[PDB]
Every structure is written in C-alpha cells, then in structure tokens.
Amino acid sequence: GRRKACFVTALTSRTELDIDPDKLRESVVELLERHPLVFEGTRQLALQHRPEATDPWYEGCQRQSLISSDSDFTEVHGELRDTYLGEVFDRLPFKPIRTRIMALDPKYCYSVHRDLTPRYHLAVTTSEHARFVFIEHDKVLHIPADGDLYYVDTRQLHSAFNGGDDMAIHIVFGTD
Template sequence: MSVAPLTTTDPELVEVVPGLGFSYDKLLNAYRQYVERVPMPLSGNPEDRLRRLGLTHRVNAEDPWRDAGNGQFNQETGEKYFEESEFSVFNEDLRDTYFHEVFKSLPFRPGRMRLVTLHPGEIYHMHTDASRVAHMAIRTNEDSRLLFRSGHTYHVPTDGRIHILNTLRHHSAYNAGGTDRIHLTMTLAD
C-alpha cells in the first residue's frame, strides 16, 4: 500500500502556526549575515566553520555560535546531555538580524534555535526527539522531505511560516535533491 505525501497538514504529524508569517527575503538575508559573521570553530578546521550553527546558547557557553548544534542524546547509550530550556540566550552578535525578530515573535519558548543544512544525498537515521521541533525553510528543493515511520513525507516550503513537526514520533529527514536544504529549526522548550 502506498502512502501519499502530506499535502495538507495532519495535526498528528504537522501543524502550521496560524496567523504568523515572516518575510522569506528577510530570512534569506539574515542567513547571509550569519554566514558572513560566523567565526572559525574552536577546532580551527575550516571545514567545520558552517557546521552545527546555533542562534541560541546556554549561559556561559564556550562557543555561543555552536553550542546549540549538538544532539540532546548520546545515540548509543540514550544518555541525555542537556535540557532544551537551558538554551535561553540569543547570540548577542546576531541581535541586529531578522533572526532575533523571529526569536522575539515566537508563540512558544524555544530551546535550541539552529540553522541545519542537509546536503544533496544526506539522510538522518530514524529517531525520535524529546520535544516537537518547529521548522522554517531558508533554502530547499521539492525532494527534501521529512519522513515519518508511517510512510508520510512532508516538504517544508519557503513560505515564511512556522511548521511544527511532531518529532516525538519516529521520523527522519532526507535531501534527494541537487541543492542544499537549509532550515531554521527551533525546538519547543515547553
């Protein structure tokens, strides 16, 4: 039996925040500003410069730019490294960007607020998260989708809207397209 992609939101899997939208052009510009400003990582490896990009961080984070880039759980042991509510500080160096306006306008308390890139051909393993995750597409292609164990897929368009995924359910994400998929993700801390 084939399962059709989700073309309308299924509240069990995806919810679009009603009445709230952001300018796609301003989101894209804020992303460009971020990329221009992000410093070299502590590793000193230039290849790591645009990996694990965070907008929020924990108090006294060693690297505020990348503190939110790590997973919440050890994938082998299941050990929890932190609580989402710890990521309560917005990066001071980005307060003049549109991302800060988004942060202040959210109808929920975000934990990790990150810029997540999936390159062509990349896929995440099937997993569950400890809380739901909101997505806004910065760049995407029609072949970049979130996949639920039920077989349903969902494409987050570049529409400036917040799409909250029920990541408490088993899910994955893949990019079967030819261009990068970049999402602003915001984990719900409440």
C-alpha cells in the first residue's frame, strides 16, 4: 500500500547495448543443447550462481520464496567467458544478479499477477505474438530482439503471453 502504481511511461525503458541478435540467438541455442531449460510453460536456465554452488545452472531458477536473496547469485558461469554470452555480460552498464534465460512456450500465457522486483530484458527470440499485458495500466508491450536492454516493471499487475508457434526467449537480468 505504501508504494503505488507507477505512471504508464515508467513501465519500461530502453538502454542501448548494440548486441548482435544473430550471434546472441545462436549462442543461446547452442547453450541449451548442453544445458536445457527446466520447467514447462515458463522455462528457465540460470546464468549466474552463488559462490561454490553445486547446482549452478538451476539453483537460481527456484521460485522467489526459495531464493535467499537475489544478490547472492553473482557469479557468471566460467564457461560463458569464451562465448558470445560473455560479451553480453561485458557490455552491461551494471553488475547483474540472478541472471536467467527465461522462456514462454508457444500458445502459453501465465496468470495475472505481480512480481516482487523488476528486471532488465534482452530478447533473444521473439515475435509479434509475444507481449506483456499491464492490466491496471491498460498497456500492451512488445520487447523486440534488437540487441538493446529493456527494463520491464513486472511488479505492476500483468500477464505475459506468447501466441506464436515458436518459444519466446529472453535473457533476464536482476540488479541491486
């Protein structure tokens, strides 16, 4: 109750990163061959882990209430340094936490709800059929796979849907 809904223009913001969409997509496709997304509907893979984690690829994918603190998930996987995903992390203007690849299945949507913390999104694979829907703000948002980073305030009441035939995939960064 003490925080109120944001003004509509504060739902999103663009930070220019100049990432190459083709190289980004091919690096994600190759990575998922070796480290598959877990879960169904909304699927996930962790790109940052807690120091000394024995389950670095999936620990950070647990539901928020099982996460001690997002800020513990600081370590980019060592093997990413050599690939184009290492280049993505190098270009970030902030220190990310609990970064995950996150995906929406084809023809899938999730419940209208509020998240606890907004994140930054880099779209990997998407289409005109994949959108965020903000219910109180009556605003529809599409995040293009243009190599730029988009803040998206998913604390606001919202759903997301993917009406396409192919899965929609983002890299989703936290910050502190």
